[PDB]
Amino acid sequence: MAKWVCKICGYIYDEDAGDPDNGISPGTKFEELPDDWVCPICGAPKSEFEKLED
Numbered sequence: 001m002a003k004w005v006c007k008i009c010g011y012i013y014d015e016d017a018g019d020p021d022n023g024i025s026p027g028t029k030f031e032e033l034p035d036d037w038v039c040p041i042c043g044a045p046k047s048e049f050e051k052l053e054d
């Protein structure tokens with residue numbers, strides 16, 4: 001599945017890994033993240049993430 005990078009701090013949201021400590025199970029697509037989800041490192045909103053793909 002896809003990876004997305006936080007343009008602020010460099011955290012990688014890996015869809016295969018999810019973010020289970022913050023309520024997101026593995027295999028959760030970025031588009032399916034709640035509107036209130038933020039970067040677990042720096043707190044950046046979803047707007048500041050970019051998908052790693054051409």
Ligand SMILES: [Fe+3]
Binds near residue numbers: 008011
């Ligand atoms: Fe971040």
Ligand SMILES: [O+]
Binds near residue numbers: 051052
């Ligand atoms: O990706």
Ligand SMILES: [O+]
Binds near residue numbers: 016017018019020026
């Ligand atoms: O994970």
Ligand SMILES: [O+]
Binds near residue numbers: 025026027
């Ligand atoms: O899941």
Ligand SMILES: [O+]
Binds near residue numbers: 045046047
């Ligand atoms: O936002």
